[PDB]
Each structure stands twice: as C-alpha cells, then as structure tokens.
Amino acid sequence: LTEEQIAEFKEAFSLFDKDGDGTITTKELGTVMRSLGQNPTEAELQDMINEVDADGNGTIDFPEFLTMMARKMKDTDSEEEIREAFRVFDKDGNGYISAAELRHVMTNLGEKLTDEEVDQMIREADIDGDGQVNYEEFVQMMTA
Amino acid sequence: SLVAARAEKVANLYRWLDTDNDVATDKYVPVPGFERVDVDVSDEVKQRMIQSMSGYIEHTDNQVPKDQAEALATLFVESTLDYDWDKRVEFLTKLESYGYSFEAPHAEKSIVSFWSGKNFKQYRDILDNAQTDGKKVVYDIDVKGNAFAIDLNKHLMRWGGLFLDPDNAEQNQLKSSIDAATFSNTGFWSSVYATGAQNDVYVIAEGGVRLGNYFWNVELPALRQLQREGLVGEIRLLDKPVSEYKDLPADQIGRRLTDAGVAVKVRFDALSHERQAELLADNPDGYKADTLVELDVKLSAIDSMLRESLPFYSLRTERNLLVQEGEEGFEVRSWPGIDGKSKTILLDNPEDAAQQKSIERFILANFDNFEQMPDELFLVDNKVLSHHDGRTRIIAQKEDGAWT
C-alpha cells in the first residue's frame, strides 16, 4: 500500500466524519468505499463488519478502513473487469462490437444516463465512422 | 387507439437503438435481439397456414366476431411472415376492437411487474401481500390482449413444427425463418406491455439477469426510457431466492441490476466453450442446450466505469441528483432534472477532477436527498461554503475536515 494511497484515503475519511473525531458510521463505510473506486457486494461489506469486529457504537476507525481497502483492493482488478464485461458482447472473436450492440448495453447498464448522454458517447467511440467500436479503445477514451 | 399510441412509442425506441445501424425504415423496424430471417415461401402455402389459423381462431373460445375469422388470420399471418410494422400494429389495433384490453387490470393501483424466471406465482403472492397501500402486482399473463396474441402465435409456430421435414433441410430453412418471425412477435408485444409501467416496477429474475432473454432485450430498454421521462422510479430486481425477500417491506424488496453481486447467465452459446465445459461437465451428468451457465462478469463494473468517467454520476446513482454545467457554475436538480427546482455549485477550478470528487464526497456525507441541500454550495480556496439566507463556512481543509 503506497503512502500516496493513504493520503487520498485520509482525505476521503475527513468528510463523512461524524463527531468530527475519527469515527465513521458503519453504513456510510459502504458509501465511502464506493467513492474510493472499490465496489464491495452486500455480503462482502458484511465481511468487513465481522472480519473487523463490530460490537455497536463506533469501532470503525480510520486504521480499520484502509485495512479493507487493502484486502478488497487485492481480490478485485477493475480494468480487466470492465474489459471482461465488454467481451461478453464480443461474440465476434475480434476486439470490436457493433455501435448498436454498445448503445443497447450502455442504455441497460447506465441507470441514471440520458438518451443524449448515450448518443454522444456512441459518436465519440465511433472514431472510424463505420458503426464499429474497439471496446478497449472506448474504455481508453473514458479513462481520460 | 391506446395500443397504436404504445406501438408508436415502441417504434421510436427500436429506431433510436438502430440509429448507428440504420437498418430500420418505413414498415420494417428491427426488434432488438430478434434478427429478421425471411426465406422463400411457395405463396399458396401461406394460404394453408392462413385458413388453418382462421379456422383455429373462431373454433376456439375467444371473443372474436363470427365471420371476422378469415380477416384476422389473413392480417396476422401476413404481418408475422413479412415483418411489416403497420400490419403488426393493425393486428394489435383490430384485437383491441374486440374487447381485448392491452392494459393492466388495476389501471392505477397495479404494480406492472416483470417475470422472466420459473415460479412467478410464488414471488407474486409474497409481493402482493407485502404492499401496504392496496397495490396489487400485475404480469403480462394478466393482459387478455397479450395472452390471446401469444395463443395465435403459438398455433402458427406449431404449424411449422409439425407440418414440415427437418430431413430435407431446405425445408428447415423455411422452419427456421417462421420460428425467427414468430419470435420477434413475442418480442415486440413484450415492449408493448413494458411501455405501460409506472412508478416502482418489480422484476423476477432468479440467479441474476439472463443475457439475451426478453427482459434484457426488449423490456429493460423500454423501462430505461421511461425513467429518463420520470414516469418510472426504481426497477427492483429479485435475483435471490424467495425466502430472502420474505417478511420484508415493499420498499425493501429487490435491488438494482447494476449493484455488485447480481449474476449473469447465458444458454451456453459459444463455439468452443460448450466443448470446454462439455468434457469438464460430461463428468457428472452434462448440459442441455438451454442450460443456464453462470458467467463471472460484473455489470457493476460497467456502472463503475461511468462513475469514474462522467462528473458527479455518483450523486445521480446514490442521491438521485443531476449536476450539469450551467451558464457558469453547476446547476443541480432532482433526477432526471426536467422538474422545476434548481440549486447551484461553484468550484474554484471546475475542470480539476480532484475538485469534483471532493465536493462530491462532501455532499454524500451531509445530505441524504436533494431537498436537504442549500440553494448554493462553494468549494473555494480549500473551504466549502453555502448561501441559504446567511453564508456559513461549514468545513476547512488543512489535510482534513475542520467542520465549523
């Protein structure tokens, strides 16, 4: 775990802070983890509530927090997860998927997206202007 | 006509999803996921199916006119085998004129529900006596218009199946074409039923979403569009077993497709993965072509992409706010941000990504909903302020949060 990594996690944990003392409410730990780029499941979050023991008031101190990020950060690998999630709609062996295939996928899995937001991104990814998309490339362009 | 209204709504959506492709035109609109396969037919043979159909119609216990039977079957059969949009609607319009209602029975007190699983009835029962508001959940089965359309479709499918020879497979291609066409019917009509959803909608899919099923292909799109119009609230997914949702309040029943944990499943369609899985599972028992294989892919990962790609997309998902860049400053509404009330956030550097994440985190910590927010928020000089009658500096940054 990098020293740089703790700097941002200290900063994130300053806010959400109740009593302004160093206690973070249990339920919000879920929220804070989701902001810091890790998506733990409904069950996996209960692991951190038990694995780091919980006995009522407080007990979710800052040291407990970056322990889980460490744990959770290890067993999850985000860029391959997104690549994996775009290959299922590959069906053709080749890296590209149809722009219509993409649009359909982005509508369904973008819950708080708008039609124009989805239209704009299908144009941006369609560099070639043919109606095919490099799914990796498209990821590449929304990682900037 | 009310179904011609819905139909028109659906034809747009299909044409919106087809914009890159532009394979849609007048009369032909492509149902998403329902490839059009049309192959050559002997013309008179159509009449064989036509008169079978017509007979079937009026020698069955259905609310159709006596002599209308010839008319109906002619319309239906042409409409199906030709992929003609106007005829598909006309057939639907006609049916609606025989006292077939294409709308849910408890017009406003019904929760339009979706079932795309196994034992809907069990789920439905728990769901029905869970609502504390006199609300009763409704499936596509409950719609008399839907059901009767499916009945006739079933009959033409069966004609093909048990009048044709697979042996001679130039005949198989005619079977595959008729199967393909009747498949897009069930597909179109599920988009009709789905454009009628309001408020909170329930979706039964045990074992997660099933890619390439009706929900994913035609229902979920129609439900998405309704949300961006503000007509539908939460789409609640019951992908766990029925017990887990037992003795739970109606609000708390189900989660979202995009949440972590929800599984995805396919019918084990791939050229070589069938075989990989075959010698790695012809070990115990085996696999039938329709056996659902649990993938290890995360739909949540696509949602995660958006959170780290679009600014304040997390306030949307987690707090149902819509932060847009305005004349100068971000304007904030309740999502989808077509409704009146408008609040503002000013940053001292509106393009810095560190800055957006900070005010983002701040808002998730202090406000549970939009209505709790002050009329103006400022992230300036490592301070956050707010103006709501009187200005206050709620927190300062010197490596941390010094509230006050």
Domain parsing of chain B, residue ranges: 2-252, 264-302, 310-396
Cβ density class B332-354: b for 16+ within 10 Å, e for less: bbbbbbeeeeebbbebeeeeeee
From residue B105, how far is each of B139, B140, B141, B328 by CA, in Å? 10, 11, 11, 49
Which among A75, A107, A123 is the end of a domain? A75
Nearest C-alpha in A relative to B257? A109
From chain B, the residues in CB contact with A12 under 8 A are 361
| CA torsion angle B390 B316 B131 B244 (round to 10) | -120
| CA torsion angle A107 A111 A112 A114 (round to 10) | 20
Let me know whether A62 and A87 are in one domain.
Answer: no
Method: X-ray
From chain B, the residues in CB contact with A114 under 8 A are 228, 336
Let me know whether A70 and A83 are in one domain.
Answer: no
| CB B34 within 8 Å of CB B17 | no
Let me know whether A100 and A67 are in one domain.
Answer: no
CB pairs under 8 A between A and B: 148
Which among A75, A90, A119 is the end of a domain? A75
How many structural domains compose chain A? 2
- Test A109 with B361 for CB contact under 8 angstroms: no
* Token code pair at residue A95: 């890296």
| CB B20 within 8 Å of CB A122 | yes
The SS3 of residue B167 is: coil
Distance from CA of A26 to the nearest CA of B (A): 13
Domain enclosing residue A116, as ranges? 79-141
Rounded (to 5) percent helix, strand, coil in chain A? 60, 5, 35
From chain A, the residues in CB contact with B306 under 8 A are 110, 113
* Token code pair at residue B245: 């949702």
Residue B10 neighbours by CB distance under 10 Å? 26
From chain A, the residues in CB contact with B335 under 8 A are 112
CA angle B162, B164, B166 (to 5 degrees): 105
Q: Is A59 annotated as a binding residue?
A: yes
Q: Is A36 on the interface with B (CB under 8 A)?
A: no
CA angle B145, B148, B154 (to 5 degrees): 140
B199-204 and B232-238 beta bridge pairing: parallel
Q: Is A108 on the interface with B (CB under 8 A)?
A: yes
Distance from CA of B38 to the nearest CA of A (A): 22
What phi, psi does A24 have (nearest 5°)? -115, 130
Let me know whether A85 and A113 are in one domain.
Answer: yes
| CB B335 within 8 Å of CB B347 | no
Nearest C-alpha in A relative to B255? A42
Let me know whether A66 and A89 are in one domain.
Answer: no
Let me know whether A7 and A48 are in one domain.
Answer: yes
Let me know whether A126 and A67 are in one domain.
Answer: no
Instruction: Report the residue of B210, B225, B305 to disrupt the A interface, i.e. the one with the largest count of A CBs within 10 Å.
Output: B305
| CB B77 within 8 Å of CB B166 | no
Which among A54, A75, A96 is the end of a domain? A75
- Test A114 with B295 for CB contact under 8 angstroms: no
Resolution in A: 2.8
Cis omega (within 30 of 0) for bond into B350: no
CATH code, domain with A135: 1.10.238.10
- Test A84 with B225 for CB contact under 8 angstroms: no
Residue type, B218: V
